[PDB]
Amino acid sequence: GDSDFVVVANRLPIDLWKRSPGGLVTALEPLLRRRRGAWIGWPGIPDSDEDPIVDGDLVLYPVRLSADDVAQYYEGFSNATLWPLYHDVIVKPIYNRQWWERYVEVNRRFAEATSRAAARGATVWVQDYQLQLVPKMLRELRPDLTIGFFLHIPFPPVELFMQLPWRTEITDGLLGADLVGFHLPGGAQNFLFLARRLVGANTSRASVGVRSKFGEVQIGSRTVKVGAFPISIDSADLDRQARQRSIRQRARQIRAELGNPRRILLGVDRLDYTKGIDVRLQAFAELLAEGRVNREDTVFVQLATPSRERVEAYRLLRDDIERQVGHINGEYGEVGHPVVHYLHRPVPREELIAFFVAADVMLVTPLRDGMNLVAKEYVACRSDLGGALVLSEFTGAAAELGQAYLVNPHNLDHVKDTMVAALNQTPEEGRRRMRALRRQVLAHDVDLWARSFLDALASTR
Amino acid sequence: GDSDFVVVANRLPIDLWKRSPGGLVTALEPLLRRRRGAWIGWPGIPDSDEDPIVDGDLVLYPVRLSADDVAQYYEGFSNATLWPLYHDVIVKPIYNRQWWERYVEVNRRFAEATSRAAARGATVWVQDYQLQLVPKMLRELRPDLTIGFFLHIPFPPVELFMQLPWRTEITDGLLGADLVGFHLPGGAQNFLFLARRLVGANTSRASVGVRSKFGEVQIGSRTVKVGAFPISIDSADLDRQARQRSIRQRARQIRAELGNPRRILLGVDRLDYTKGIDVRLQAFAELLAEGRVNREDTVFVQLATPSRERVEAYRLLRDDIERQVGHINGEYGEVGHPVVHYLHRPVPREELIAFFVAADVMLVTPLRDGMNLVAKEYVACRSDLGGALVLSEFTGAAAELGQAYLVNPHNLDHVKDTMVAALNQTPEEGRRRMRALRRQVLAHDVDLWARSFLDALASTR
Amino acid sequence: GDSDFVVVANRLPIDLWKRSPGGLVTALEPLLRRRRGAWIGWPGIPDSDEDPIVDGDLVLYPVRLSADDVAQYYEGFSNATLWPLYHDVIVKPIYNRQWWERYVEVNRRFAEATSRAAARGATVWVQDYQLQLVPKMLRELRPDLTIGFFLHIPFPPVELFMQLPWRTEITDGLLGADLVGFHLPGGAQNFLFLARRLVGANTSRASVGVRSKFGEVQIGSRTVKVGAFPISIDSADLDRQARQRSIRQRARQIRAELGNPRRILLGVDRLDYTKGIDVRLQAFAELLAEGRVNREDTVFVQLATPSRERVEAYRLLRDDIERQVGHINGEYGEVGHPVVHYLHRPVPREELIAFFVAADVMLVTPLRDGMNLVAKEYVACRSDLGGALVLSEFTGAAAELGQAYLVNPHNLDHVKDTMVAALNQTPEEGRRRMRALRRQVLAHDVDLWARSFLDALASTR
Amino acid sequence: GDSDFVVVANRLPIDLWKRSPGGLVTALEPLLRRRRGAWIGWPGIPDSDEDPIVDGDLVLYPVRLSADDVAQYYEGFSNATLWPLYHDVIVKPIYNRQWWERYVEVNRRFAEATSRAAARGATVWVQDYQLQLVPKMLRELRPDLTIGFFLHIPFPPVELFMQLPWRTEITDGLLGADLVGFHLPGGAQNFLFLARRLVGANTSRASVGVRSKFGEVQIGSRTVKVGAFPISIDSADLDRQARQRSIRQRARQIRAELGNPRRILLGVDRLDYTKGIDVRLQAFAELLAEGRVNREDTVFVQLATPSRERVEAYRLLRDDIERQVGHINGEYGEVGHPVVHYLHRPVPREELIAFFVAADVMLVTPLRDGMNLVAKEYVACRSDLGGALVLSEFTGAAAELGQAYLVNPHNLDHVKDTMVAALNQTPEEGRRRMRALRRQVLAHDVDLWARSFLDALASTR
């Protein structure tokens, strides 16, 4: 094709159609103004055509997937094999050969679509865990290409990764890239060690820096660069949006509809067993039982956005959470006044922002998370410097947001102590922490992240 | 002793102490004004003395039970063997010989306490399923006594009753009475048939009437009378209480705290798998899913009062209900506005009455219930003639309250159609039904019930 | 059509084809020698033709059923609604409207096939619980027909039957017959009472006899006869077969292959939660634990023939039984010598007979069973007068086989005492019981049963 | 005290008393001949005295533990917190503060007993995961002591270890030793990294060798040596024992009692979810289903020795295994001939050896195991060079026994292919592998292991 910069991701950046706002596609916008850019991905509808769609600023190359392809490659291998394994086997991975075979077939299809789109010597950026085979496949089809890969989820320790029957094929797949990136040095280091242990490659031995001090894996003639690039958000855009009059009015109205509580705790997560939602509810229930939280003036709002309903583990998790909600309200609420409000539905963006602005305490307690953007979005929204962020150590965000109230979600006693501390912090201490968090998040945004990855990738030429 | 009228029940009519209001003890009040009355029962505290406590109007004979006695006789045999069996094995009965043996021992202890209290030729009224052995034991100790027994729960069909390894001992136990009473002719008829089948006794063959047309079982020289006496409430007292200014004000305030819904559905139950609470929640959820109930102006309040937490079946039921609550609100509620309010705690009497007065639809949907007094209490409270009663056929109350919206709780389609009908009834049709229900309940109260049983018992002399 | 005697049953009497041996079709053989006989049923293959197949002695009228029809009418309504309900809700019935609707449609299809086959004034005999609507449907299409119906499973008490949302349609369905038969007087009496209670029909009030003293239900102009006819086997044929040299040799070989135990206990059941297989295993395990059975010279063989694998309750039951087997052998067996041998597969007829002949104790312990033919087959096989039958009271067979060791399967203590008694009986006592059981079974065979039902049906003309 | 060499372990080396044969205490025997040796541990009985017991060759210092101490320190913290966590969270660890507190208290008690026994400047060797706090505690009480610690179970990756709320206290605890040893370089390397990440200590960065190329952690003034020392058995003793006439006769008799199969597969494990017993049964069942194993001449014997019955996870595992056994025999066995023989009981040593000698295929398929001595015992027993070892990669043994048939137990397809390969290997190929395995195991025995650890520990002086 005629594209000199190509993004490859599981989905096209569109909504059933119009171009989806925010996210990655928006971060790459000023680069697409200087490159002939293409995006390869599944359009979210089964058995579509693979004819290029030109969005003026971007050419879209759709990948044809059947509903069966999605079930086995995505719902199956990606979400029920790789996802639990890479997140410290919080649930038991399912190892299924038919899923693996479809994962391979689908990955090859993405590689072929990429080759179609990519001009000679083009730069290719492959995204995330569903497409780990693409770099090697693409290099085999197109050795002229410069290929980066970024993993948006954690890379597990070798002891767990080795369970995968197709461990070598996945590792070889990633090693097809010129640059392999992770959010954290820890992931990068796991990858280097895996390369020595499983593949027998020569690697660098030093610690991996942040956006610097890169690792290397020697693969025959070529070197694979390995780095840590912690993703972020468009901090300035969110900061601006959260100041809008209508947002502030909605935040006030939200507190009124809750019966004007003195304190609001907020959870916002795509529903997932990685997110530690059960831990928040348990801590909140025990604090109420112990009379350490006032059931008359404190309320917890949990917004869970629907996710992967076709995967049994997620249905079971939804059942457990919903029981806890029912239980806590039955024990500590009053008719007309729950202590927990729980919604299981997508939330409009401006509604989400209003909740961030209304919340006195943001509860972000994942058991394991690659980064977690919600923690950073909350911070970017609190230009009033109010609020408090309670944040699990087991998120990538915790490496940057050390001024938050950090918790080990497995240490329930300390999660409880910490929620009480956040609820009762002095105004001045709250401001001190929020000012420091905002300096970090405003300076380290999605633009810095993308530039850093692309600079590293360009240097491999 | 010196008491010529003696009530025997699992518990003394007191609260940890003061005499408990309402109920049986209040219905017998004008009889105790003419008799030397006694009450035998456990005082609700472990390992107490058995020394008589004179309440001027009544002498209380406490029965000493250890916490272990309560666990095996009551929590065990009564609540985990007899209770599920007599209620159509909604949950699997547990047959345990140690429980049976303690049930026997405890029953003998009640029989001994009774004999102590009862004067020569005295009238004795034994209450309910925990004390089914007492009549035979008492007749053996004291053949001079006139003994009635009333079962407050259903008497199961013979096919189920026969499962009980101690079926003959229980049947013989009841046959020790001069009069055996049930709420319904159906129970009485089951008992007659059981007497022929299991014991080989000669019995009457005709249908058993209501408070009349009694059955008989011939036991050697003596005849056991068998009858149906449907319990009720103090209708006039509740009717009066519900008109109080403070109650009406609270009912208005309740609707305001719910965000002034157009329609309130109400469930009030001691928590129990017999009560069909899960069925109401399922019906309500499906109606919301189908858009047949308006999620913006209709709300369901379920008040579940704690019961038998030491019994695993009840903990599991509580878990299922609480999941449904969480689920329904997550799907159809809004932050600040649940469609289901659920409380798991005792409710003050005047608060309960305010809820009856506030509720547009009373949901009483047991899978199986001896009578269900809540259905009658709601009716007695609605002197404004507003409201609507949705009532399971599988309650004793359904035999008297035919003007209610009757449902087969297993017929979920019809339960749903019926809830929509009740919510949308014309004012005039609602009044017609409520007027008819009140005529029944006001005329057939707990005083008529008690008089009828005691007249029948006196006639056995 | 031109058939003056027509049998209607869920399946044709054939095997995927050849005419299936034994059973009903063999009992009717000398009647088909005098009548133009027809058989209506599903041929066991999906979407077949409905063209008559003449077997010289019989005309076969196949009913076309799709795999979906079978799933909803049979696997669904028959096996997951009616079956658990009629067997004292050992598992929870599922009430599903789509299943009911297919059950109706399929029943009408059987009725139409019947009408096609049946000559004017013909006698029709409809079999069993899958076809309860057929008599009324058939009478509506063909008021000239004489119609009998026999239920091969128990008829539940009214308290349970009333759960069925389509209770009235089923009752009306059965009332379409001239004669409704059950194995036991108890079923007949339940039906009479149901007729009064649900339908408001006038019925007889006396006890129902065995093959005599029939009940009646008055339905407008016509009377429905109600009777008890306990099914049996071809006792003489089995008695003869069990004496064959090859059978006796196999029985000896079976004992040798088991390591020549002193005592063999045997269970033979179509796998079903009604059969009380779990109870036998529990009793056997506790006896071994208590050292009351000798683990060195006593062995239990359980033959479970596969049944209804598409129904979840049966898969769960299979899992529980298989755990008990594994557990008991792990605890009390030796390598090379299990104390329990368990097979889950169909057994050839002559192999089954050899096991009957080898077994010292036959364990037939259903929680609830219409008759249970295995109990009678064992007896018919023991012309040597050896062996012992342990038999649940909750089978129809227990009403005729009172000389067996009868047990309440819920009374585990007594089941255990009884198994020890059977294992250790004197030769003379064993013979006394087996002689008496054989007199009953040899005199009361399937020929007496069929004649009695057909005589009763003929008398309705 | 007066002991210059002291072993500290959870239990004394005795049996309820007499000195237990084999194991560690036997390996140290020629060292105790030159040192004043002591052993500190719990005597296995609750609330005993702590008075020294002199065994002439050894002084025993008993530690007083109550049954409650054992429940919280051992059954609780050791077996339900540490054990699952260190074994790649195959089951979910339970984090309980009361368990942690008892673990601390008990560890301090072991430290005090040690100090009592240990002479000035004595050498102390602390054993295993129940006693990880002892080295730091002991160094604080007795800075004169030389302290080694060896972990017999895996040391998990940092991502999992970090879950532990008391992660720092455990790490500091181990860092109290002069020498910290693991079976594998991988564990040692995890420990070094943990030291940098959690404690901020300076460590060596190179790979850790086997019994050489040691790692180091700098802790203030002192250096902690870190090493890999793979445990083994008394290879020569077992080799000798397995040649005994009575053992060989028993092995022949075992095959006869199994009905002289052509092939015997054997599993021998302390029952534990780490052991992958479920995987063997699944593979065996699928091979039978596929007809790839002959159900007529191949038999699988699984010997599971009882373990940790008070821990719920182990009861659930026992239930799953026992179901699989029952299921497989019901499907593929015959009466008198199971395809799986399963025993849940301790086996005498000489019986175990006879089974090793009888087995054509040894199935050692743990999901995760520190070493696994059963794999090495089998090899040492096969001086006839017959047999075949199927061995999980996820055992420490797999690093030394590469000539075995290695499998990824999560790769069920390959486990199945491998079992077929082992069952059908040529005699010559079997001998080649067994000869090579025996050279390794005979040369690398428990004496080499103990000498190597003690030499490393002595060098820290």
Ligand SMILES: Nc1nc(=O)c2ncn([C@@H]3O[C@H](COP(=O)(O)OP(=O)(O)O[C@H]4O[C@H](CO)[C@@H](O)[C@H](O)[C@H]4O)[C@@H](O)[C@H]3O)c2[nH]1
């Ligand atoms: N408009 C709107 N309505 C909702 O209802 C709504 N609900 C949520 N959101 C927004 O979605 C995003 C969720 O961000 P995550 O951090 O949870 O990312 P993941 O989905 O888990 O996916 C991976 O990739 C990320 C980036 O690399 C990593 O952080 C993760 O660790 C990694 O798992 C946030 O921005 C949030 O605000 C909504 N947005």
Ligand SMILES: Nc1nc(=O)c2ncn([C@@H]3O[C@H](COP(=O)(O)OP(=O)(O)O[C@H]4O[C@H](CO)[C@@H](O)[C@H](O)[C@H]4O)[C@@H](O)[C@H]3O)c2[nH]1
């Ligand atoms: N004050 C107050 N606070 C509460 O929270 C509160 N919560 C409930 N209640 C009152 O308790 C009574 C419950 O009546 P039930 O009908 O449910 O009776 P059971 O407890 O099930 O016991 C048996 O005996 C009865 C009589 O024979 C039969 O009807 C039953 O079928 C039979 O099972 C009602 O009156 C109700 O209003 C409260 N009252």
Ligand SMILES: Nc1nc(=O)c2ncn([C@@H]3O[C@H](COP(=O)(O)OP(=O)(O)O[C@H]4O[C@H](CO)[C@@H](O)[C@H](O)[C@H]4O)[C@@H](O)[C@H]3O)c2[nH]1
């Ligand atoms: N050849 C062969 N191989 C096997 O593997 C094999 N396995 C079993 N059998 C034979 O099947 C028959 C099972 O008889 P049931 O009594 O259990 O009858 P159900 O199947 O439950 O069906 C209903 O109808 C019966 C008659 O009215 C009632 O007794 C029942 O109560 C009622 O539920 C016996 O004859 C037995 O020997 C095999 N026969």
Ligand SMILES: Nc1nc(=O)c2ncn([C@@H]3O[C@H](COP(=O)(O)OP(=O)(O)O[C@H]4O[C@H](CO)[C@@H](O)[C@H](O)[C@H]4O)[C@@H](O)[C@H]3O)c2[nH]1
């Ligand atoms: N006599 C007798 N009767 C039995 O019934 C009987 N049943 C088993 N055994 C013997 O017990 C020993 C079990 O050895 P393991 O390797 O399984 O060790 P663990 O118990 O899991 O404990 C840890 O420490 C070991 C050494 O560091 C590591 O290998 C382990 O990875 C690690 O978990 C073997 O020797 C075996 O033969 C019996 N012995």
